Amino acid sequence: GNYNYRYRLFRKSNLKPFERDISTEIYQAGNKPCNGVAGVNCYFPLQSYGFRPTYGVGHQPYRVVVLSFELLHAPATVCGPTNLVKNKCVNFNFNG
């Protein structure tokens, strides 16, 4: 059981695009005050992931990588593969 991976379910607020949340405070879920102590109307937002090779594929862990490019000007960083002419009508591909 790979319980190292964990997820959050009892979070009050939504997140903006590409917004990180790392706070692990006890989530106050309702009317009765908790004063920071889990109990009535209070849950822990963090939950460990039950992750074993014996599991359903939907329940099975998936490694997800998200890349957010910016196809705009300014120097890039990635561009697979020249010589500049200087007076003739020639197609140019200067950094993008």
């Epitope: 039950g50 074993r52 014996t54 599991y55 359903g56 329940h59």
Partner: nanobody
Framework: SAVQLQASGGGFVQPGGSLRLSCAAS????????MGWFRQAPGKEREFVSA????????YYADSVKGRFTISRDNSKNTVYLQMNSLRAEDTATYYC????????????????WGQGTQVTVSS
């Protein structure tokens, strides 16, 4: 499908004795599923303890608790009861009540719920 499983009780007891673990549901679940417990030793990862259904038909005990810890649900009180005996070292930890959701157990793998626990300490 969100339960605020309420837990209460605890105290300090002596080694080699016996006690009980508490786990009661005070919220709205997703179905009539299984109930159990999970424990975590200091400096060690969380460890599964025991598994039992809504009707105490199937009795899955851990080997560290077999013959000594006898889990059993209630005729009418709707509460499983892990009654201990001859306590060992591994059974003294911070316990969390487990809750699965299945009738025919193909595998004991899928978990569905969690709740608060009871502060049980076993020392002289």
């Amino acid at each position: 499908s969100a339960v605020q499983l309420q837990a209460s009780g605890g105290g300090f007891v002596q080694p080699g004795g016996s006690l009980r673990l508490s786990c009661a549901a005070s919220g709205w679940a997703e179905t009539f599923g299984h109930m159990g417990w999970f424990r975590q030793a200091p400096g060690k990862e969380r460890e599964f303890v025991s598994a039992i259904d809504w009707w105490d038909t199937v009795h899955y005990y851990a080997d560290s608790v077999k013959g000594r810890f006898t889990i059993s649900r209630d005729n009418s009180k709707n509460t499983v009861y892990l009654q201990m005996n001859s306590l060992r070292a591994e059974d003294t930890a911070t316990y969390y009540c487990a809750y699965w959701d299945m009738d025919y157990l193909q595998n004991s793998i899928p978990v569905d719920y969690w709740g608060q626990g009871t502060q049980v300490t076993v020392s002289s």
